[PDB]
């Protein structure tokens, strides 16, 4: 319900343990998530949002520069589709920087203060859509939050700025499958 839990110690295992490419040795200080547990994850969540919403639903993927997350969940829920009756379902996105009498899902990759989602959230509501649930992968414990919690939570994590698997940082660490923490060499490195 609350997600998989990242305690504050000791979270993320070392950078030996996992594969991890050879130019971002330095970038990244620890693993909080390897990509398959992040695939296992996924998995469970959308069943459970399948479980939530027995409605043809609208797949609301929010969208800013990755596409990862919404891609691999959506790609379960059709594995779970596959069984059972000729289920449609639209997939349709808001980019940020029709719903009305619909079952929305609304897809993030992560919440660190809530507020752009918040702010997502009010901007649907004016629709008046027959119900809005909320995914997100990745939920930060931080106090800069302002109390909003989605429906529906992948992972908890300690309050880090982490990149990879969805998450990049300046055009960069697209190819890093792991969720992992950026180094203060890899801040500078990247920096715009
Ligand atoms: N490590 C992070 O919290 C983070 N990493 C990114 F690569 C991008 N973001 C982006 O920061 C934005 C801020 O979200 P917020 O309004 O603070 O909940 C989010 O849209 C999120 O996608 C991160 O928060």
């Not at 639903?57 to 800013?64: N, R, S, T, Y």
């Not at 009756?85 to 993030?108: A, W, Y």
């Amino acid at each position: 319900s609350p997600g998989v839990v990242i305690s504050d110690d000791e979270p993320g295992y070392d950078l030996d343990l996992f594969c991890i490419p050879n130019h971002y040795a330095e970038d990244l200080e620890r693993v909080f998530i390897p990509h398959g547990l992040i695939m296992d994850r996924t998995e469970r969540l959308a069943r459970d949002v399948m479980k939530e919403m027995g409605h043809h639903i609208v797949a609301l993927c929010v969208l800013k520069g990755g596409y990862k997350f919404f891609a691999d969940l959506l790609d379960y829920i059709k594995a779970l589709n596959r069984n059972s009756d000729s289920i449609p379902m639209t997939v349709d996105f808001i980019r940020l920087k029709t719903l009305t009498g619909k079952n929305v899902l609304i897809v993030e990759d992560i919440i660190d203060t809530g507020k752009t989602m918040q702010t997502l959230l009010s901007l649907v509501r004016q629709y008046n859509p027959k119900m809005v649930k909320v995914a997100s992968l990745l939920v930060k414990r931080t106090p800069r939050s302002v109390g909003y919690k989605p429906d529906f939570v992948g992972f908890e994590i300690p309050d880090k700025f982490v990149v990879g698997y969805a998450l990049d940082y300046n055009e960069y660490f697209r190819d890093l499958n792991h969720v992992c923490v950026i180094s203060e060499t890899g801040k500078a490195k990247y920096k715009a």
